[PDB]
């Protein structure tokens, strides 16, 4: 059971209500129950925000809540810093972790609408000009013409209808260059296609943290985090990105699911820093991408009030639990059960449209054949 705000009280503080709370940490707490011999209730925080000693100053939410006395043990994913360290104690962390940045995964989006472009249209026309002219020129070089067009047409196209052959010696030498021209032309086409298929898709356009587009913000890229989070502490203690830091205050939030759906609706381009949650978000959503280098090596452990008699004991269990691998069992229980495609940004194409264009060319040539054929019928 879970005594929490009815409408979650983000402004209209509907009174509390028993809900159902359950997850990894709950498992942890019940283990610590079986090993520590205590009983308890459970409740939510007043605000939906971790807390910080903002301006006299005072800590929002759970921090100040514990500090008062109305609380006596704080178990949740909790970061570690110096500020919180100044007042309370907490044992070794139970899950090491860091920071990363997530972006709405892009689609491969093959580009083959060049189905006749990658040389030119100008080339596509001058080649037909050249074929006609060299055809009739070979004809004159003979002295088998009305169909000699078939000859060069096919030898470009590798048809093999070959109704005849040049009887004169002149063209009987000439045709070689035409053959080589066809060979090198198709070679060229293949080569430029292969090259044009090297243009990669730069996804993690931000390099770790030193990317200036994210080291100096551009209006083309939107970005934020959750307000009053420890991440803000980390930034404002590192004055460098202050601008971006200042900049990001134009976009901050109050909940993680906020930024979650924000990047889901493709407006917000990046969410951050809840790494050990971004993993589940990704491997259960498979429309998002993590990246960056790990920023702030820290760990989630359990905090308790100042110098309670419990500290010395708690740690023990944890290591005991880290000994028998029970931790890893909980991992397999609540962690690995999410999976989607994870190979890489794979290059491929099955483009129905870029070949549907040429299939329509097929169908059009069909009616062209009907028309021209009956034209020749009436002719003969």
């Amino acid at each position: 059971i879970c005594t929490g705000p009815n409408d979650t009280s983000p402004g209209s503080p509907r009174h509390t209500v028993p809900q159902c709370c359950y997850g990894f940490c709950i498992d942890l707490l019940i283990k610590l129950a079986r090993t520590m011999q205590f009983t308890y209730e459970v409740h939510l925080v007043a605000d939906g925000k971790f807390g910080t000693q903002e301006r006299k100053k005072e800590w929002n939410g759970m921090m100040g809540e514990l500090l008062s006395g109305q609380a006596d043990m704080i178990v949740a994913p909790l970061t570690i810093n110096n500020e919180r360290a100044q007042y309370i104690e907490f044992s070794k962390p139970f899950k090491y972790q860091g920071l990363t940045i997530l972006v709405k995964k892009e689609i491969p989006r093959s580009t083959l609408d060049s189905f006749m472009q990658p040389f030119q249209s100008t080339l596509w026309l001058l080649v037909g000009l050249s074929v006609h002219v060299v055809a009739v020129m070979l004809y004159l070089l003979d002295r088998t013409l009305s169909s000699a067009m078939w000859f060069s047409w096919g030898v470009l196209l590798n048809s093999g209808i070959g109704e005849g052959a040049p009887r004169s010696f002149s063209a009987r030498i000439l045709g070689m260059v035409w053959a080589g021209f066809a060979m090198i032309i198709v070679a060229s086409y293949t080569a430029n296609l292969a090259a044009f298929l090297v243009l990669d898709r730069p996804e993690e356009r931000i390099t770790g943290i030193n990317d200036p587009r994210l080291r100096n913000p551009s209006d083309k890229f939107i970005y934020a985090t959750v307000k009053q989070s420890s991440v803000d502490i980390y930034f404002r203690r590192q004055v460098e990105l202050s601008t971006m830091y200042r900049h990001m205050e134009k976009h901050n939030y109050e909940s993680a699911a906020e930024a979650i759906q924000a990047v889901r609706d493709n407006k917000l381009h990046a969410f951050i820093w809840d790494s050990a949650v971004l993993e589940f978000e990704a491997s259960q959503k498979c429309d998002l991408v993590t990246t960056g280098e790990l920023f702030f090596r820290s760990g989630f452990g359990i905090g308790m009030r100042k110098d309670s008699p419990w500290k010395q004991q708690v740690s023990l269990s944890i290591l005991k639990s880290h000994e028998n691998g029970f931790m890893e069992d909980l991992d397999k229980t609540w962690v690995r059960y999410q999976e989607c495609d994870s190979r890489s940004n794979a290059p491929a194409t099955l483009t129905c449209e870029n070949m549907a264009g040429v299939f329509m060319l097929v169908a059009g040539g069909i009616v062209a054949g009907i028309f021209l054929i009956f034209i020749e019928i009436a002719y003969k």
Binding site: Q117, L123, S130, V134, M137, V177, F181, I185, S188
Partner: peptide, 29 residues
């Protein structure tokens, strides 16, 4: 650089015209 240059086909029609000229020259015989 997707579409090739018309100029970026020099040797093509170079050899084309060369063959045409050699053809006429020999066909004189």
């Amino acid at each position: 650089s997707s579409q090739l240059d018309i100029d970026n086909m020099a040797g093509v029609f170079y050899m084309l015209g060369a063959a045409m000229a050699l053809s006429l020259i020999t066909f004189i015989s």
